[PDB]
Amino acid sequence: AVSKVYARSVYDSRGNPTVEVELTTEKGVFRSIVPSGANTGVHEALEMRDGDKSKWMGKGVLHAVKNVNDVIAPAFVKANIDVKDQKAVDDFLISLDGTANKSKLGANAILGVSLAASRAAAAEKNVPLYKHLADLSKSKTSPYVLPVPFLNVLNGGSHAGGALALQEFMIAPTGAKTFAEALRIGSEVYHNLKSLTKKRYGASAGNVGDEGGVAPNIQTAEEALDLIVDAIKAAGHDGKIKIGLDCASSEFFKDGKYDLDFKNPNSDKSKWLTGPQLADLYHSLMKRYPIVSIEDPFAEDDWEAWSHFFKTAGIQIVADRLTVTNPKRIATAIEKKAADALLLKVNQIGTLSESIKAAQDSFAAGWGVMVSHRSGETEDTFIADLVVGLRTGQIKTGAPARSERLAKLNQLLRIEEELGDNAVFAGENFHHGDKLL
Amino acid sequence: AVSKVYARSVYDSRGNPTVEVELTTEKGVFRSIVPSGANTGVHEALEMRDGDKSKWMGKGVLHAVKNVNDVIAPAFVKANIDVKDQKAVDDFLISLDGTANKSKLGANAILGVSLAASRAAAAEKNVPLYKHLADLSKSKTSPYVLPVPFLNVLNGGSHAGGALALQEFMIAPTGAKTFAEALRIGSEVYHNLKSLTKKRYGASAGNVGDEGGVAPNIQTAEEALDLIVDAIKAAGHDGKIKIGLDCASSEFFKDGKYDLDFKNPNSDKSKWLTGPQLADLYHSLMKRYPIVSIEDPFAEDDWEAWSHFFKTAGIQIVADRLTVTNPKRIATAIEKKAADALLLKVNQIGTLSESIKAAQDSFAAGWGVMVSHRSGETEDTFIADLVVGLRTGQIKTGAPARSERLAKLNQLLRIEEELGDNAVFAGENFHHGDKLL
Numbered sequence: 001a002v003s004k005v006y007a008r009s010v011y012d013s014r015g016n017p018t019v020e021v022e023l024t025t026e027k028g029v030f031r032s033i034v035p036s037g038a039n040t041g042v043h044e045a046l047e048m049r050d051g052d053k054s055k056w057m058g059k060g061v062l063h064a065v066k067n068v069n070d071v072i073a074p075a076f077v078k079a080n081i082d083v084k085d086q087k088a089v090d091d092f093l094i095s096l097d098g099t100a101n102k103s104k105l106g107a108n109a110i111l112g113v114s115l116a117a118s119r120a121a122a123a124e125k126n127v128p129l130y131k132h133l134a135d136l137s138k139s140k141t142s143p144y145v146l147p148v149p150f151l152n153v154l155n156g157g158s159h160a161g162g163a164l165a166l167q168e169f170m171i172a173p174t175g176a177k178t179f180a181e182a183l184r185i186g187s188e189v190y191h192n193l194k195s196l197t198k199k200r201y202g203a204s205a206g207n208v209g210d211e212g213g214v215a216p217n218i219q220t221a222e223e224a225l226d227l228i229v230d231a232i233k234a235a236g237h238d239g240k241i242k243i244g245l246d247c248a249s250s251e252f253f254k255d256g257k258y259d260l261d262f263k264n265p266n267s268d269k270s271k272w273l274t275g276p277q278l279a280d281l282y283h284s285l286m287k288r289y290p291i292v293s294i295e296d297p298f299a300e301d302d303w304e305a306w307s308h309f310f311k312t313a314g315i316q317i318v319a320d321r322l323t324v325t326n327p328k329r330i331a332t333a334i335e336k337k338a339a340d341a342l343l344l345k346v347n348q349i350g351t352l353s354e355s356i357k358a359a360q361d362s363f364a365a366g367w368g369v370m371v372s373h374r375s376g377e378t379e380d381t382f383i384a385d386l387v388v389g390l391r392t393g394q395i396k397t398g399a400p401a402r403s404e405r406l407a408k409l410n411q412l413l414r415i416e417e418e419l420g421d422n423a424v425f426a427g428e429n430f431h432h433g434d435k436l437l
Numbered sequence: 438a439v440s441k442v443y444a445r446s447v448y449d450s451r452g453n454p455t456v457e458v459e460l461t462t463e464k465g466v467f468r469s470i471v472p473s474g475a476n477t478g479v480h481e482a483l484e485m486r487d488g489d490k491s492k493w494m495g496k497g498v499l500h501a502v503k504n505v506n507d508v509i510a511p512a513f514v515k516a517n518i519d520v521k522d523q524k525a526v527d528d529f530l531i532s533l534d535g536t537a538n539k540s541k542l543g544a545n546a547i548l549g550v551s552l553a554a555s556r557a558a559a560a561e562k563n564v565p566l567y568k569h570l571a572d573l574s575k576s577k578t579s580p581y582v583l584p585v586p587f588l589n590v591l592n593g594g595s596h597a598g599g600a601l602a603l604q605e606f607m608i609a610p611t612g613a614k615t616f617a618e619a620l621r622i623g624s625e626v627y628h629n630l631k632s633l634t635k636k637r638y639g640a641s642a643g644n645v646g647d648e649g650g651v652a653p654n655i656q657t658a659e660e661a662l663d664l665i666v667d668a669i670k671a672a673g674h675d676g677k678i679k680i681g682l683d684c685a686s687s688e689f690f691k692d693g694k695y696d697l698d699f700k701n702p703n704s705d706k707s708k709w710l711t712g713p714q715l716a717d718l719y720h721s722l723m724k725r726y727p728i729v730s731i732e733d734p735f736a737e738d739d740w741e742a743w744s745h746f747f748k749t750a751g752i753q754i755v756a757d758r759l760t761v762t763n764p765k766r767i768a769t770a771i772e773k774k775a776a777d778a779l780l781l782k783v784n785q786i787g788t789l790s791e792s793i794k795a796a797q798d799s800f801a802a803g804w805g806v807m808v809s810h811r812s813g814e815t816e817d818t819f820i821a822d823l824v825v826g827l828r829t830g831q832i833k834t835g836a837p838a839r840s841e842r843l844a845k846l847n848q849l850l851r852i853e854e855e856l857g858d859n860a861v862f863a864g865e866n867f868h869h870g871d872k873l874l
């Protein structure tokens with residue numbers, strides 16, 4: 001059935017190379033592209049880079065591509081694998097590599113084959129990809145569930161000037177009745193925000209960060225949040241749009257404490273916050289703003305700070321760098337009551353099967369799952385089908401700007417259209433989209 | 438045989454709606470997404486926008502989509518057209534509309550059908566799209582020619598704060614031996630530029646505009662160009678990277694004069710330049726920098742200035758605003774010897790046949806053709822296959838950032854790989870790509 005496996009270098013949305021895999025069967029040629037994060041969690045599966053400073057700023061993926069072409073491909077073609085059996089596909093890939101963190105072959109060599117295999121399988125079954133992914137995950141299909149998009153609108157933190165410590169501010173049109181409506185009203189908030197931002201901060205603050213949000217020089221979280229509320233009001237959608245945060249607090253964690261002025265080299269060490277103090281800051285925000293989700297409020301191994309905040313949070317708390325889409329870390333997060341939602345990034349773990357397992361483990365513990373892009377994305381639309389397949393009710397895949405983001409959101413429009421009356425929009429029920437009836 | 442024509446609303450790279458068309462035949466379903474264009478203006482084909490301020494900021498395409506679904510579709514399917522006959526497809530669409538500027542049905546409605554048909558045609562012929570497009574254009578196929586990418590790196594004019602009057606600064610890796618090498622060395626130059634820009638102008642100057650270039654607050658053409666030269670040198674590619682400009686001088690044309698300080702509201706009239714004075718500035722830039730192409734050096738109707746400059750320019754002069762991909766304007770520009778290259782925007786004319794014809798007329802006059810993106814692009818890769826089909830040697834499709842830009846550049850990588858020894862890179866011969874042997 002699988003007659004050829006092939007990899008090439010292509011460019012991601014930041015202009016860095018990444019791995020593209022093609023798998024050939026009797027049904028044709030199936031393409032998958034591997035995304036790439038920035039400042040990746042210490043516990044992420046290995047993204048293999050060449051480190052040749054004379055090529056691509058040291059960011060080549062020739063070694064990973066060669067691992068697909070020269071290592072995986074001939075073994076895989078000769079293994080006679082049934083692509084419909086994703087578990088077998090991934091058991092085979094994992095066994096070749098033989099390392100816990102996929103450092104022998106690279107997670108970016110393994111994932112492309114893993115994903116392409118599922119695309120070939122959907123074609124063999126003559127079903128759209130989301131239907132096949134629902135099969136793999138054993139999700140309920142009457143109805144299917146369309147996700148609330150968590151749309152990045154404003155960018156802070158590492159990639160941003162100003163003193164704004166928190167990294168992502170998202171809007172979530174939970175009040176919409178359909179995905180199409182959600183994306184329309186979201187886009188309208190975005191345009192109002194871009195307009196407000198250019199008027200208040202100058203023409204250049206209207207330019208966008210890696211995920212398509214505006215990135216003005218903002219001083220505080222309150223300034224950013226007041227700006228967003230203004231955009232929601234101006235677009236006329238007050239009451240229909242909620243807010244999500246990704247704090248990316250690992251970026252400002254220094255020896256036990258949290259430096260909210262970490263962009264300032266002469267930061268006052270005596271002003272760095274403890275776990276409980278930072279949690280106080282979040283509660284202050286949650287009281288003044290319609291915040292329904294907070295991601296990585298504390299650092300990637302700061303278990304105690306997570307568990308403490310979770311007792312009284314009362315809103316969705318999303319694990320990203322804490323859990324790294326890794327069932328082993330998710331088990332720890334569940335036991336410790338650290339969070340109540342998984343940010344699912346297939347390339348943090350390296351296979352579709354492990355990713356599906358991570359989602360299933362989360363759902364089983366009463367957690368939600370927010371399927372996620374990476375900050376370096378591509379024209380690949382896999383995660384749009386994956387979020388529907390997993391029935392999660394929520395995705396973050398960027399601002400409604402830059403087509404590595406729109407490709408996913410557009411694919412959701414297509415899936416919504418196709419599904420017709422056998423789909424429902426998760427809306428206010430996004431957190432438990434998987435249990436929505 | 439076409440059994441179905443269908444349209445839906447999707448989002449472009451700026452978060453504005455655009456038309457997506459699907460044409461169904463026995464070979465399957467074939468999709469086109471149209472870039473954004475103009476809904477008002479002289480000489481160019483007009484896309485249809487809804488103008489409902491309560492939806493999508495007035496930029497809905499529901500009417501255009503309806504025109505496809507309720508008008509074009511039933512008549513098109515009924516007419517039983519041979520999709521391989523692109524001329525007949527386009528004559529049919531043009532006739533149904535009945536207006537010179539496609540304003541009855543919308544250029545967006547028409548173009549979507551035009552393009553989807555060529556994809557269906559390629560499939561019927563069992564050839565890649567670029568091969569079918571070469572057939573339609575009667576271009577030479579031994580070898581095929583891969584284009585030099587003119588990569589946007591830096592924007593000024595109305596696309597930035599500061600005083601920089603000129604709009605676009607591009608790099609052209611003419612010194613590369615393959616398209617793959619050209620894109621690699623181009624991305625390295627861009628990263629170095631992004632790095633230098635953030636160091637010299639602050640972190641926010643690293644945010645990207647619509648087409649992926651940076652927009653720091655720059656004072657002069659010289660300052661921008663010195664910055665680009667530094668980036669080229671830092672990447673190690675001096676001698677291999679050339680520069681293209683888009684002056685967009687229509688933006689700073691007031692009276693019969695050119696105001697290089699147009700962003701200053703108290704700008705000093707009488708410091709404004711005549712044609713010949715502006716030509717002196719371009720000449721001084723040409724002596725100091727490796728500029729091989731200048732787009733829109735003079736205003737869209739200032740024919741005498743264009744013709745005067747062209748006599749002694751000695752480098753590629755590209756018509757954009759002057760010609761607006763309009764056959765009558767092109768003929769005039771050819772006769773007046775105003776320029777020697779056409780910026781070809783398929784959605785500015787509205788059909789593939791007319792786009793191809795405009796290119797052929799340019800080539801017949803010894804002009805080059807630069808296939809061009811739009812500000813609002815999509816994940817659709819059509820123009821990558823078009824530039825190859827037209828054998829032009831040059832494409833302008835954005836910075837190596839944002840995937841509406843990278844989708845095209847990636848598709849060119851794939852096309853190059855597929856063609857192998859059947860293709861050559863245009864390199865230094867970009868201007869006469871079509872005549873290259």
Ligand SMILES: [Mg+2]
Pocket residue numbers: 104
């Ligand atoms: Mg090795």
Ligand SMILES: [Mg+2]
Pocket residue numbers: 131134135141
């Ligand atoms: Mg099923």
Ligand SMILES: [Mg+2]
Pocket residue numbers: 246248295296320321
């Ligand atoms: Mg995160």
Ligand SMILES: [Mg+2]
Pocket residue numbers: 568571572578
């Ligand atoms: Mg041919």
Ligand SMILES: [Mg+2]
Pocket residue numbers: 683685732733757758
């Ligand atoms: Mg122009």
